[PDB]
Design a protein around this ligand. Structure first.
Ligand code: HEM
Ligand SMILES: [Ca+2]
Ligand SMILES: [Ca+2]
Ligand SMILES: [Ca+2]
Ligand SMILES: [Ca+2]
Length: 312
């Protein structure tokens, strides 16, 4: 390649001006802030719009291409601004929206401490059609409906748990509109196991207004809990996997990267793409060991796995 850098394949040098723009003009100087949290989420809301029988283009960038339609899906509340945030970048550069969505996601994760380098591929065509509605899992859906939807897209129950490691770097804006920016765990700027830990704590309070659609009771003030994350943490089909995450940053990193790659290829083929994983920067180290919040004991944690009691 040219000024600065060089990578395994020549067509990957195009990503580097892109890499520079989004770190400064989208990620606030390569930080793990809100825009990073929304780009990661965006990859899912684009890709999960796929079903072998119901339709959808998958990771086709349709959520940007047909933002008028898809950003007004009820399940896409609050996505319309990461779309408009990424649009000027899609406009100036010559990669497809499908490619850019995944790149911004991958690059963004590597800005977060404890993060991982997700494999990124280049060459997706432009979006042909808008995704059908009702393909995006809602936080008030049952475990069965979530697992069936993710399963219909080709994800096993354990894979769903793995992909939900994303909630370690996450916050909600539309669940409780009164308290926007309330994170899913106590360490939203760090990619750790604190999400799986605090989810297993018992419900104690509502951080904002009284229960509204998709919200379960939170353990901590300044933290919000989705109704879907609470159930998945306790459901026999996934409880043991959810608890196994509270243990293992290596596994968390390992599994989050292997499945995101699988997700990013939904309806896209292999050989038509080229590999530019070389481009993704390397995340900083983990900033502290796992722990229960102050004032909490191992009793405060709910047990949902019958095989192995919650590991101290
Ligand atoms: C499987 C069922 C899932 C459900 C029901 C769900 C639900 C939600 C909801 C309701 C929000 C907050 C929306 C708002 O800001 O108002 C959220 C945030 C987020 N989700 Fe999920 N999600 C799921 C899976 C995933 C997956 C597979 C990923 C993969 C990357 C992911 C990544 C994220 C991220 C990064 C955020 C933070 C958004 C922000 O900070 O604004 N989620 N999720
Ligand atoms: Ca799509
Ligand atoms: Ca639903
Ligand atoms: Ca975290
Ligand atoms: Ca206490």
């Amino acid at each position: 390649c040219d000024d600065g850098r060089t990578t395994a394949n020549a067509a990957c040098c195009i990503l580097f001006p892109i890499l520079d723009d989004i770190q400064e003009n989208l990620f606030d100087g390569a930080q793990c802030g809100e825009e990073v949290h929304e780009s990661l989420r965006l990859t899912f809301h684009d890709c999960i719009g796929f079903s072998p029988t119901l339709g959808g283009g998958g990771c086709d960038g349709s959520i940007i291409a047909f933002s008028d339609i898809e950003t007004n899906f009820p399940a896409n509340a609050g996505i319309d601004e990461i779309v408009e945030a990424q649009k000027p970048f899609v406009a100036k550069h010559n990669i497809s929206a499908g490619d850019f969505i995944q790149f911004a996601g991958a690059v963004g994760v590597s800005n977060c401490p404890g993060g991982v380098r997700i494999p990124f591929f280049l060459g997706r065509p432009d979006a042909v059609k808008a995704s059908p509605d009702h393909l995006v899992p809602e936080p008030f859906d049952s475990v069965t409906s979530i697992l069936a939807r993710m399963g219909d897209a080709g994800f096993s129950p354990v894979e769903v748990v793995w992909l939900l490691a994303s909630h370690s770097i996450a916050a909600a804006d539309k669940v409780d509109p009164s308290i926007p920016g309330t994170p899913f765990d106590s360490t939203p700027g760090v990619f750790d196991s604190q999400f799986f830990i605090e989810t297993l704590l018992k419900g104690r309070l509502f951080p904002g207004t009284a229960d509204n659609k998709g919200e379960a009771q939170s353990p901590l003030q300044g933290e919000i809990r989705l109704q879907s994350d609470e159930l998945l943490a306790r459901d026999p089909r996934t409880a043991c996997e959810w608890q196994s995450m509270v243990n293992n940053q290596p596994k968390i990193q390992n599994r989050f990267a292997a499945t995101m790659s699988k997700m990013a290829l939904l309806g896209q083929d292999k050989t038509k793409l080229i590999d530019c994983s070389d481009v993704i920067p390397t995340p900083p180290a983990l900033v502290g060991a796992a722990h229960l919040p102050a004032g909490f004991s191992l009793k405060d944690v709910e047990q949902a796995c019958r095989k192995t009691p919650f590991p101290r």
